Symmetry: D2
């Protein structure tokens, strides 16, 4: 499990459940190509996005669909989504956890990177 996404709700103090997540990888032609996607679970985690074989070196963008999340909760938030862009695996395979902490007008994102 080379890449995991974890999302928390700062208004309720709980995992953010059912959050849509789309990962893209920057292509040779320079455009964003769809790479993987999924929804967070009851713990606020999204496992199984990818495998060590597929998750090669490159520039990746993890889009977290914060606006859908807030609206399904009846709330009208500021941001369209949270976007986290980073180069991955360029000195060998790492494990990456992308955490995000959501409020309606604010979010925080943190990367925890450990050597597999």
């Amino acid at each position: 499990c080379p890449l995991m996404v974890k999302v928390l709700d700062a208004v309720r103090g709980s995992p953010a459940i059912n959050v849509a997540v789309h990962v893209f990888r920057k292509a040779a032609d320079d455009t964003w190509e769809p790479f993987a996607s999924g929804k967070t679970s009851e713990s606020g985690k999204l496992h199984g996005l990818t495998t060590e074989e597929e998750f090669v070196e490159g520039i990746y963008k993890v889009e977290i669909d914060t606006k859908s999340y807030w609206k399904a909760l009846g709330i009208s938030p500021f941001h369209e989504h949270a976007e986290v862009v980073f180069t991955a695996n360029d000195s060998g395979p790492r494990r990456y956890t992308i955490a995000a902490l959501l409020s309606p007008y604010s979010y925080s994102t943190t990367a925890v990177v450990t050597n597999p």
Copy 2:
């Protein structure tokens, strides 16, 4: 103005207005003594807490009354208050801004220390 406090509300996307802020200085017996206090303005700021003359090196605690802030908005919060504890040193730059960004179950605080 050597010490300024600034508070933002992450749920409404606004300055946090009328938030009570109490500052204490650690005394030689180790208790916290009231030092200054105020309420944040319409822009979420509290100016005029002390003067250069009074703000000597020492250990200070800034308590930001978040719980009453969230309750006046009808929103259920987690913390009793947010608390920022630090040593003021004449070495480093000269003005201290303590900024805090509040959510009901989360906050962050940052020291902006400048000349």
Copy 3:
């Protein structure tokens, strides 16, 4: 000034100075078109990005070049840049401040939307 950007450095406890900031507006074909850009000042602020007349409702992206900021400080960062994407609506208040607080492996961004 309807749109202002403000950036703080959580490692040094200072405004983030000379940070490049590019703003884009989503076009009808769905591409991002350059809209405005600048570098943050000595107080970590970027004023003068647009005018009321130009800043119409639409979807905007603000890209904050954190990677080059950390590299000029000799500090190894994680993200390529920080990216804030939002719809500007004439309904809500009238001035938008996008604030960001940067660490090498973490950032937060907050929209302060006021009258």
Copy 4:
């Protein structure tokens, strides 16, 4: 495990290891009484602070010794420690996770509260 503390280092993108943590509980006389303490592990977590039996209703303060952490890393930080104060268990037992995300001049703290 009713109360767990998790600490991350935002400069390195990794768990904050060996962080001292002291919990206090506000006493009848109104002073802070020592309640429990421990150090974070290699994952940045501190388990076993307390038990459901001991962790009764009250006002608790979790002090995270951020200044020692930064200094053992050769860094001179702003804050003495991070202090997280909250009422616990006042409508029954909950599980509480207190997370903190540390930078030398800044920290974030989040509470995740779930029903046991």
